[PDB]
Amino acid sequence: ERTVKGVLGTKLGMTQLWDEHNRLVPVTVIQAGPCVVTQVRTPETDGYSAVQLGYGAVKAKNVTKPEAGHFEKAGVTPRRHLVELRTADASEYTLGQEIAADVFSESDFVDVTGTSKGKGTAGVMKRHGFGGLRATHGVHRKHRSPGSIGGCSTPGKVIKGLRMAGRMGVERVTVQNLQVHSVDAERGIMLVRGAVPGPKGSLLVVRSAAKKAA
Amino acid sequence: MKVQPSVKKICDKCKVIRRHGRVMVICDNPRHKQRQG
Amino acid sequence: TTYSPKAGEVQRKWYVIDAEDIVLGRLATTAANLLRGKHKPQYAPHIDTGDFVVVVNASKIALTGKKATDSLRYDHSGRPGGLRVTSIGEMLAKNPRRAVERAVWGMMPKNKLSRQQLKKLKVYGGPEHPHAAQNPQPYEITQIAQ
Amino acid sequence: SRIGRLPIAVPSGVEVKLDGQYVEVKGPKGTLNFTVREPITVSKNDEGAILVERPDDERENRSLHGLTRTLINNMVIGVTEGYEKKLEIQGVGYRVLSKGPKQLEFNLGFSHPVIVDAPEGITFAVENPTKFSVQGIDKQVVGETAANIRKIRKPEPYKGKGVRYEGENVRRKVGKA
Amino acid sequence: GKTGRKRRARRKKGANHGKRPNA
RNA sequence: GAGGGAAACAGCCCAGAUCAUCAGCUAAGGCCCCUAAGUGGUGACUCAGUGGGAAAGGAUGUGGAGUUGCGUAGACAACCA
RNA sequence: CUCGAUGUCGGCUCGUCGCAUCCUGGGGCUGGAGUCGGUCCCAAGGGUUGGGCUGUUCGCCCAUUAAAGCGGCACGCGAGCUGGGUUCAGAACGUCGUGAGACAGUUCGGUCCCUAUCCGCUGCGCGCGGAGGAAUCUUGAGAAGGGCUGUCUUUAGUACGAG
RNA sequence: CGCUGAAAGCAUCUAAGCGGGAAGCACGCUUCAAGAUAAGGGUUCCCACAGGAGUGUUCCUGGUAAGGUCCCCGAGAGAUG
Ligand SMILES: [Mg+2]
Ligand SMILES: [Mg+2]
Ligand SMILES: [Mg+2]
Ligand SMILES: [Mg+2]
Ligand SMILES: [Mg+2]
Ligand SMILES: [Mg+2]
Ligand SMILES: [Mg+2]
Ligand SMILES: [Mg+2]
Ligand SMILES: [Mg+2]
Ligand SMILES: [Mg+2]
Ligand SMILES: [Mg+2]
Ligand SMILES: [Mg+2]
Ligand SMILES: [Mg+2]
Ligand SMILES: [Mg+2]
Ligand SMILES: [Mg+2]
Ligand SMILES: [Mg+2]
Ligand SMILES: [Mg+2]
Ligand SMILES: [Mg+2]
Ligand SMILES: [Mg+2]
Ligand SMILES: [Mg+2]
Ligand SMILES: [Mg+2]
Ligand SMILES: [Mg+2]
Ligand SMILES: [Mg+2]
Ligand SMILES: [Mg+2]
Ligand SMILES: [Mg+2]
Ligand SMILES: [Mg+2]
Ligand SMILES: [Mg+2]
Ligand SMILES: [Mg+2]
Ligand SMILES: [Mg+2]
Ligand SMILES: [Mg+2]
Ligand SMILES: [Mg+2]
Ligand SMILES: [Mg+2]
Ligand SMILES: [Mg+2]
Ligand SMILES: [Mg+2]
């Protein structure tokens, strides 16, 4: 229902800048490269309004026949990635249209979505901030234990949703209201004030800020 | 408003009504407003 | 030896019921009876001999008293504080199919066969259904005197 | 229903269409419409009046009888004469002004002026910075609009400051005796 | 108690005739 | 002390299992669906989901039956002195 | 009910639920000048501090805070921890007993264990199905998380008030 | 807290109806999600193979297409998968 502008990019890393109030600002560098409209979704044929964007450099021998046919119908060269943008203005998008970082101006607030860095199987003390037990005073082989995990004969069970150890990281995380610092479209570079999820080289979705601003 | 199981006329101007299944006392004087509960 | 149906021996038909201004209880009892095939002399509890029921206009099911806002339906996700509750009026407005299926399932035996048979109930809140190919015949809820 | 059993006299220029359960009332001031509850019927009584009949002498029959009689009489008297309500404001610094027949601006001691829009059938009429009025063709709508205007700043029991009805008997006491 | 009250009130069912073990 | 009823439920209700039966009639309890048999017939009452837990006390809920005061010398409300 | 064993206080850890609401939200009556208050309703979304004393619960106190809620869950939680208290054998004091000894009197000291089978729960795979076999992008029935709050500035020394 | 308004000639937030009204309810925000066996939808690719039995072809073997896995080099991933 909401109209969203969007673009796809790659997390190149971070550096720092100084703003006009001489304030040090951390900036993430996103190679908000050229994206092409591979497919437009309409209520008539698909049931919702969204725009599928491409983006990515792919080797010709690593694109299969179904993907090649999809891109041939789109009328564009094959791209590595394909990500949709749920926008209510999908129609205004034509098949094969060119999208560049200049879709965002010098002070727009954006939401950046990416897959967070993985940590493997994490303990409770790390993946949930559990305070363990003391290091001394008789603590017996339970320094990083989760403590109790329930009650007693009532309910004689462990409630669903209890926080215990497990695999943390590698998940969809959206960080909101990041003010774009600068856009240089002729080389497809975006400087966004903040820290975005994911390791260097990961795919990032930069969309217009859902909550507009602070 | 006073919420009491026992609501009665206090003055001569108070009126007892049944509103939305509850017995209430309405009066020009706001002190006499009552509701069963 | 008493007769017993053989798998596909009993031919299953398609009925359509217009739930227009019909009480939910009567609609659900009729649907359960039809789905289980209790109106057939070939009935057998262990073999599905019932018919398919297509209910239309489920959004206009009649409710008596203050049921539309005081008769509640509960679901629990299985975790603490995982209860949701919604009134039958809201459920008929939003997802009438869920309401009709809940009523019919409650009125139907608690069986694997009953679970299978409940899939034969096709509930649509509007006046139109997509099963013209199956050619459902209209069914009128009636009573037999004395 | 002693109220209901009394007839309703249709005045000149008022068109009363009794299309079964649904009724139209045309007049010089506008148009109103209403549906009577089912166990109550309406007749013309020689086309010069209106009658409402309860089919039984139960409670809901009599109650809806009186209700429908009063409400039909209200719509006809509205379409033949309208509805008027006078609201007066007391307290220093309080003012009301008009940006048109359907737009009011109130300075009721707030931080900023407050804007009041009117519905289509509601028209305001201000004559004094401390007195104004609302008119319409629906008694219920006029009454609720006046109620909202009063709710903006209801009278107080200390210095009366607030929008009050013209005949409102506002209570009052004394704090710092 | 609620449990005791329900246990005592169970004797009012039709098939029982106003009596039930443990009241 | 099985069987039927009581949701489940040694002590309550019905009823005392010799075995077989793919016969019939009943008991308690039941007859919209779960669940076998009535969404039974006729006349009232309830609209609280009361039915399907509870007290002192409280209440212009609603139906019915009285007793009694006043009243077209004109009653009760509403409206002018 | 359990004596062919259902481990008993407080803290730690982890929560979850009730509302008989401590704060924050809304409203009546009072009021109450205002400022504040106090009381009868609503309301459980979130939040509800750190220390001194004592084994303590409780309680008192210090310094804060929007506030430092009350309760249930085997007085939640020892196959999660703690062993300071309690309730073993040592010893001492007081009291009692002729004495062995006794004391919900006091004091110092004082062993526990468990590689998780089943359910439960946090994660992660394999299989098969999804009426041909595939590749990509998805809808969301439904599920979970999140929901706190202060101070200052301004409106304005305005409203109110004799000040 | 109301508006209109009877039953009850008035009145009444209520009996018909309409409006306001909280950090609560449901959304809004974020995340998982078709084992949702109701197993969804769009787009794209591959194609009517071979040999036996057969009993409407059925079904069982065999080589493939699109595509995928094994194996190897790794990390932005990871206990092992
Ligand atoms: Mg630590
Ligand atoms: Mg250690
Ligand atoms: Mg258990
Ligand atoms: Mg008690
Ligand atoms: Mg015997
Ligand atoms: Mg027996
Ligand atoms: Mg029995
Ligand atoms: Mg039984
Ligand atoms: Mg018989
Ligand atoms: Mg009998
Ligand atoms: Mg059963
Ligand atoms: Mg009948
Ligand atoms: Mg009957
Ligand atoms: Mg009740
Ligand atoms: Mg009840
Ligand atoms: Mg009672
Ligand atoms: Mg044992
Ligand atoms: Mg409460
Ligand atoms: Mg809480
Ligand atoms: Mg809740
Ligand atoms: Mg103490
Ligand atoms: Mg607690
Ligand atoms: Mg305990
Ligand atoms: Mg334990
Ligand atoms: Mg010790
Ligand atoms: Mg011990
Ligand atoms: Mg000495
Ligand atoms: Mg001695
Ligand atoms: Mg000791
Ligand atoms: Mg272990
Ligand atoms: Mg959903
Ligand atoms: Mg599920
Ligand atoms: Mg009134
Ligand atoms: Mg009023």
Side-chain angles (χ1 to χ4, degrees), chain A, chain B, chain C residues 1-93 95-146, chain D, chain E:
Chain A
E1 179 183 34
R2 181 171 56 96
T3 294
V4 192
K5 318 166 84 170
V7 66
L8 308 169
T10 291
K11 178 166 163 170
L12 304 186
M14 281 196 255
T15 179
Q16 67 195 15
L17 295 174
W18 277 280
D19 74 16
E20 61 86 20
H21 300 311
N22 297 295
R23 179 161 299 91
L24 186 74
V25 289
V27 298
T28 313
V29 188
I30 305 169
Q31 189 274 330
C35 315
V36 289
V37 175
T38 317
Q39 171 162 19
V40 168
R41 316 270 220 195
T42 100
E44 293 82 3
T45 44
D46 291 331
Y48 66 106
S49 309
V51 184
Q52 164 166 119
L53 314 178
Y55 172 81
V58 71
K59 274 189 275 225
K61 66 182 181 180
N62 268 340
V63 57
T64 58
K65 286 186 82 74
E67 304 170 332
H70 188 57
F71 285 116
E72 182 65 26
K73 175 167 190 173
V76 308
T77 57
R79 306 292 148 107
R80 181 178 292 279
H81 297 294
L82 288 177
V83 180
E84 277 178 359
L85 169 74
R86 272 285 287 264
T87 186
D89 71 351
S91 328
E92 284 75 352
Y93 286 87
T94 186
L95 208 57
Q97 179 197 352
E98 182 65 26
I99 284 181
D102 61 332
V103 70
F104 291 116
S105 70
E106 190 276 331
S107 288
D108 291 288
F109 288 92
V110 293
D111 288 18
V112 179
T113 304
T115 48
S116 50
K117 283 158 95 90
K119 321 271 179 206
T121 293
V124 289
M125 283 195 53
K126 174 161 164 75
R127 86 184 286 249
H128 292 125
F130 277 28
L133 302 186
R134 284 85 170 93
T136 51
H137 291 291
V139 172
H140 188 47
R141 294 187 313 248
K142 291 286 168 104
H143 304 289
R144 305 179 72 82
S145 46
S148 191
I149 65 172
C152 205
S153 275
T154 290
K157 76 180 184 171
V158 174
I159 63 156
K160 210 168 302 189
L162 179 88
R163 300 143 92 209
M164 325 195 295
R167 257 167 71 169
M168 182 179 72
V170 193
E171 64 197 341
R172 195 155 190 281
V173 171
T174 297
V175 183
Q176 309 168 291
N177 288 336
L178 281 72
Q179 193 202 69
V180 163
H181 181 99
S182 65
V183 185
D184 186 74
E186 61 86 20
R187 72 186 58 245
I189 293 297
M190 212 180 267
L191 296 204
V192 162
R193 184 179 296 113
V196 305
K200 291 195 268 187
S202 296
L203 180 70
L204 297 182
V205 186
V206 183
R207 293 147 33 197
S208 301
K211 288 184 254 207
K212 311 308 178 70
Chain B
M1 185 180 288
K2 294 181 176 67
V3 175
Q4 291 162 354
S6 179
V7 297
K8 296 183 290 294
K9 291 174 70 175
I10 309 194
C11 59
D12 291 331
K13 337 286 265 236
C14 307
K15 186 180 289 293
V16 176
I17 61 192
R18 193 145 173 300
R19 194 181 277 167
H20 295 156
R22 284 185 191 151
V23 175
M24 293 177 71
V25 173
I26 47 159
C27 199
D28 294 315
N29 190 355
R31 293 181 184 271
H32 299 104
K33 284 166 63 179
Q34 292 152 73
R35 198 250 294 170
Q36 276 190 350
Chain C
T1 301
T2 305
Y3 161 83
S4 185
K6 288 186 181 64
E9 158 163 16
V10 193
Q11 188 274 331
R12 299 183 294 173
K13 302 184 194 304
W14 279 70
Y15 296 116
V16 57
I17 300 179
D18 196 347
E20 182 65 26
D21 285 331
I22 279 156
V23 189
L24 177 68
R26 299 292 179 90
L27 170 63
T29 45
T30 287
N33 282 329
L34 287 168
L35 289 165
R36 291 162 72 224
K38 275 226 169 180
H39 63 290
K40 289 166 171 172
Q42 274 96 21
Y43 165 80
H46 71 287
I47 285 280
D48 172 20
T49 68
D51 309 302
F52 299 81
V53 186
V54 166
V55 176
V56 303
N57 272 328
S59 289
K60 294 171 159 58
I61 291 186
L63 302 161
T64 61
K66 303 207 280 183
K67 279 173 189 167
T69 187
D70 296 6
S71 170
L72 304 202
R73 305 289 193 270
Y74 295 87
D75 291 331
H76 203 289
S77 66
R79 68 181 65 252
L83 212 52
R84 67 185 184 273
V85 57
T86 188
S87 81
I88 184 57
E90 313 184 5
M91 185 179 288
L92 280 178
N95 179 345
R97 161 183 271 172
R98 176 83 182 124
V100 180
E101 293 179 353
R102 291 182 55 137
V104 174
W105 168 247
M107 289 186 208
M108 185 179 288
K110 299 316 166 293
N111 287 337
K112 314 182 264 286
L113 185 57
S114 297
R115 297 247 185 221
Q116 180 57 246
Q117 289 176 303
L118 193 71
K119 307 169 194 222
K120 304 195 297 186
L121 174 68
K122 319 280 164 66
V123 181
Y124 303 94
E128 294 293 328
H129 65 83
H131 308 297
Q134 273 59 53
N135 205 336
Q137 295 298 109
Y139 185 90
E140 294 293 328
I141 299 170
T142 187
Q143 193 179 336
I144 297 169
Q146 87 183 358
Chain D
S1 64
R2 216 187 313 257
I3 286 296
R5 65 165 51 171
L6 269 296
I8 303 304
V10 169
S12 78
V14 176
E15 284 85 359
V16 185
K17 293 93 168 194
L18 311 183
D19 291 331
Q21 202 71 259
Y22 182 76
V23 172
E24 296 85 2
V25 174
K26 287 307 305 273
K29 288 197 160 70
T31 174
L32 311 180
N33 290 318
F34 182 76
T35 302
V36 179
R37 188 51 78 97
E38 58 93 17
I40 303 283
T41 59
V42 55
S43 74
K44 284 294 283 177
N45 189 359
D46 291 331
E47 303 96 39
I50 296 295
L51 294 174
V52 288
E53 34 280 357
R54 58 177 182 269
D56 170 34
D57 296 0
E58 52 198 12
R59 317 183 321 120
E60 58 264 16
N61 270 183
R62 299 178 279 137
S63 292
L64 293 164
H65 200 244
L67 183 63
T68 47
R69 193 263 190 192
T70 314
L71 188 153
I72 297 287
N73 205 357
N74 282 21
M75 65 183 73
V76 298
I77 196 181
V79 301
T80 192
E81 198 267 328
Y83 290 113
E84 182 65 26
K85 286 202 78 62
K86 290 175 53 62
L87 309 158
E88 65 183 1
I89 319 169
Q90 287 69 240
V92 72
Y94 294 168
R95 82 191 42 76
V96 54
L97 72 164
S98 183
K99 308 291 105 178
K102 316 171 82 67
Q103 207 59 60
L104 283 199
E105 311 312 338
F106 282 98
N107 287 24
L108 274 168
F110 290 145
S111 80
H112 65 279
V114 65
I115 312 167
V116 165
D117 302 341
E120 54 271 14
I122 289 279
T123 58
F124 306 121
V126 62
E127 58 86 19
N128 187 280
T130 56
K131 286 208 294 294
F132 64 111
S133 300
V134 54
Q135 62 258 7
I137 64 178
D138 190 318
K139 200 176 205 181
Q140 177 262 329
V141 183
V142 170
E144 62 86 20
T145 300
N148 291 327
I149 297 307
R150 176 162 156 275
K151 279 204 178 205
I152 296 174
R153 184 149 279 257
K154 202 258 300 92
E156 28 134 354
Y158 259 169
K159 342 258 309 287
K161 296 180 85 115
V163 178
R164 87 168 56 191
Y165 289 115
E166 181 66 30
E168 208 188 309
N169 180 76
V170 168
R171 279 181 98 94
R172 221 78 87 71
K173 243 2 238 319
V174 32
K176 235 193 122 320
Chain E
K2 184 177 180 180
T3 308
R5 276 185 325 242
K6 284 165 105 157
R7 184 185 44 107
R8 270 181 300 281
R10 262 198 277 286
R11 80 177 169 91
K12 275 215 271 173
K13 293 282 178 67
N16 317 115
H17 280 42
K19 296 159 280 153
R20 199 130 171 179
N22 310 310

